[PDB]
Design a protein around this ligand. Sequence first.
Ligand SMILES: [Mg+2]
Ligand SMILES: [Mg+2]
Ligand SMILES: [Mg+2]
Ligand SMILES: [Mg+2]
Ligand SMILES: [Mg+2]
Ligand SMILES: [Mg+2]
Lengths: 178, 195, 130, 19, 181, 244
Amino acid sequence: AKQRQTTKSSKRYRYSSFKARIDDLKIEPARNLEKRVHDYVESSHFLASFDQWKEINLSAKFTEFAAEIEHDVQTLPQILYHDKKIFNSLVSFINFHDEFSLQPLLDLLAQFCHDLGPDFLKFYEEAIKTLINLLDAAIEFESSNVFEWGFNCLAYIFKYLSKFLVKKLVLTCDLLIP
Amino acid sequence: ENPADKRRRLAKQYLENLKSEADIIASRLKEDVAEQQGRVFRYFGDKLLISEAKQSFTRVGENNLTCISCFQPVLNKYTFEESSNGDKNKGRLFAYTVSKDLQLTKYDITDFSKRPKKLKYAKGGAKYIPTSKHEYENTTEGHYDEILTVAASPDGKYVVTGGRDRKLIVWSTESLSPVKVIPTKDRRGEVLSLA
Amino acid sequence: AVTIRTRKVISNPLLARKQFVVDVLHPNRANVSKDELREKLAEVYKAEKDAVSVFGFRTQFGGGKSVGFGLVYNSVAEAKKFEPTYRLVRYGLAEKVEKASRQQRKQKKNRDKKIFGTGKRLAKKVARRN
Amino acid sequence: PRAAKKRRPAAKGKNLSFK
Amino acid sequence: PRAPRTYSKTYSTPKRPYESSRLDAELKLAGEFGLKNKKEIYRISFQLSKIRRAARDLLTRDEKDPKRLFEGNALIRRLVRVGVLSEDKKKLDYVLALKVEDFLERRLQTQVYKLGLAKSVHHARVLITQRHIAVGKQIVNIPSFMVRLDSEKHIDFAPTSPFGGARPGRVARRNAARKAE
Amino acid sequence: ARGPKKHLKRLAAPHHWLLDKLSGCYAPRPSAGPHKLRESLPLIVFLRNRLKYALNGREVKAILMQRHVKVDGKVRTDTTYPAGFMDVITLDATNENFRLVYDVKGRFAVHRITDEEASYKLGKVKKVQLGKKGVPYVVTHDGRTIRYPDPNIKVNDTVKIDLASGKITDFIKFDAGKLVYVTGGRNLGRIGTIVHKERHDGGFDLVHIKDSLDNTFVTRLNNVFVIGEQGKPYISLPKGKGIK
RNA sequence: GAAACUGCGAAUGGCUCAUUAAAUCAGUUAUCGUUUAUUUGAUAGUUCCUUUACUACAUGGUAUAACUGUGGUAAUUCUAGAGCUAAUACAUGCUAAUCUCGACCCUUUGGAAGAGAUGUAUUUAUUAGAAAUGUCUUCGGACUCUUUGAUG
Ligand SMILES: [Mg+2]
Ligand SMILES: [Mg+2]
Ligand SMILES: [Mg+2]
Ligand SMILES: [Mg+2]
Ligand SMILES: [Mg+2]
Ligand SMILES: [Mg+2]
């Protein structure tokens, strides 16, 4: 408590409390310099990440989510034409608060905003509200990974919608007051 | 104006075109990706009118024309640019023909009502017989035996030919100029079909 | 040219990776270095080279083909966490630990066994004695 | 009761060439 | 310790090796098929003896017996596959009628000689041992290789061979270089 | 020997594990647990030699220490934990639920099940007795001691145990015409309906079983496991339905 | 995090075939003839009982190592005297409950004046361990009786 883990042991694996992970965690996605799948795109950011997550994650909820939305994300016009249904499904599945499936869904939500930035504005209010409930839900089941995914999703949205949110920065602040 | 917005603009314009053409929009988007699913999605056989077909025959000086390959630009849904090699070739349909006369010819078939129109050609002959007599040295620019086959690259940038001269020559589309020769490196490796 | 194909791809969220059999066809070449394969599988799967490991390459008799195993971790941190230490050393992600040979360490262990406690008292006693 | 249905493989082979 | 790895002798010395007729037989077989020593003939004889003894045991058994049907069908299938037994003699009786010459004739050396890639059985052996012959996509450097019916049509010069379209061997380019200088 | 042994030779290991004879010199010795040594599948073999999720023992240890593996709804970290017959192995990360049931060949099969089916297991009632303070209890084949049982439950009957609470939801009596799974001997893995139970006082009872394909075979009562009523098993069966 | 105490292991592994002629060993039985670290599953509210003159918001050295310092022996994985200090070591020792009936009211989601009952562990002795075919009722149900289990 008084002294942090300043001197590291020779052990390769060390226990870390949930609070310990949270203290070290810092939300700044630009600081991370690992390769991003969405940097390489053939059709859209959403499809590029969506294909990757299908192959890594096998959770029950994400697999069900993929089946519903697989046919409607093959091409960027398809995403734009079907933006309403995609967003509702993303919000619906994030509401389940299933830790095994949050990481792909949250990542796709941010990339979804990337594909259609100005058009995501009509979705902006609902996305922030859903994240706030998830983070408030995240308190009861302790998982530092969940917080990192949620806030990084929040940070990404600000990055893509930087121009529009800045014009009404007070409005964005008002949502995050709680 | 990051690249993501550019795709959005082209997609937005593309969707507008479909709306101008026209459920229907929702369906039409599906047929765009129907190619990825390897199943029939072009049911038009009963719509064809064979009886009214406008048939025509165009004589060619070459003897025993052996094969023909046709190139058609196609719009790329992912990026929304035509497969045409250049701006001049926007929506120009080409057909390449080869014959036992060791001559490669290209024609313009864009105008359906009009007959094919020759543009350029390249002919081989005894000049191109390899001197070395070794298979890996059969790297002459032109053909010296019967050409059997020809194929047009989907990008519209290259045309490839092969025949009994056990070589695979790839030519520039506009000018039929050779750029590479790839011997099959076999005594009986006579190319019979290209796809 | 040289071709790579990944087959029998199994996703392993338990270890957070993808494990597959890598087949490399390299006509007119002796064989292909592991670092190149790491670079290129990294480009393929859209992951860091640090997160890609390859091993067990055996060239087929007669040459022209090689077969081995490959792993692609979801994140470089996961690879550092789960990979063997020696493989990390091969790729430079970890530094080789310098240690004495087994005989020297064992002899030191026996010598330390013979002495009880810190031993400074023994040192001062012998210093006084002589 | 029926057993759980097998899941089609999530991952598939993939290829490139260079040089 | 580690569990044993089993092994078995693949040949057996004949009963009376110094029989004059036997010596002449071995001479003729080696001359025809270019065999290196008597060990190869002994090996083929031992394999044939095993096959014929198994066929004998099966024939002794009553017809329509499960063991007879199963094992005879397997043996006929294998012998047909290797090509020794033809498609129209699929009976154990013709298995008892097999001879050493059939198995010798399926050797990759003899097949290479017959197909015309070589001018003699010894030339076929030399080509095989120098890595010039490929059965399909695989280079085979073993004269005792047994060629199946399907693999028979795929025997060819290996891509890497100087005869198969690769660059000339060291001697050829050495001579070309000195001639150039 | 002067005490319990702690090593197992590969050749001495159970055959049905299908362990390579040339891989090494020793095989995983199952630790003490619910199932006997010879009728158990240690988690290392299941994770490495059956599912192939791990390539070596250290990887299996790493997987287990992550607490990704649950046995009967409880997290286990022992590499040689003796999982056995009618054991439920859950891997949440892969969304996979397995039940250990022998195949017709006689080996444990990788049988995937749904969550609803994984929520329970079946246990053969090995013993019924009154404990201290006159509390009746039943001991099953997996070493589970369950108090306050139904009086009708007797030895050789099968109890459906809910993993979450470890209580008896239902039970099936041992009687002619009941569906039965063989867990021992050469007929191990077969499935059939009871026909008759031959009772010999002071000796091993014999049970005659009849398969769907009309074949009959006799097996000792100890190798019998009642799994439901004919045509209506209480657990999803593996491919082949225990035929031949 | 050296050292030391504590806990566990060291009774497994490996090697050899001296002794051994119903012995070992192979197959096959039994423990209703007994011990079993460990794993796994269950399992323990005893309210009260005069010096309450009372620690449980937590007791002692009835105690030492490591450590400081003074020494013996030619010599060892030898150790003496003195001084210190810990525990999941050693030795002590506590803190307004639950359950039967239930009169009387009240007629239920009922309240309860009151009559009663109270762990384990070891040793011995003893004990247990085997024509209600009616009546009414709302047609449901109620009225009297049952009361250990297993193995051959
Ligand atoms: Mg060579
Ligand atoms: Mg008995
Ligand atoms: Mg004697
Ligand atoms: Mg005896
Ligand atoms: Mg222990
Ligand atoms: Mg003292």
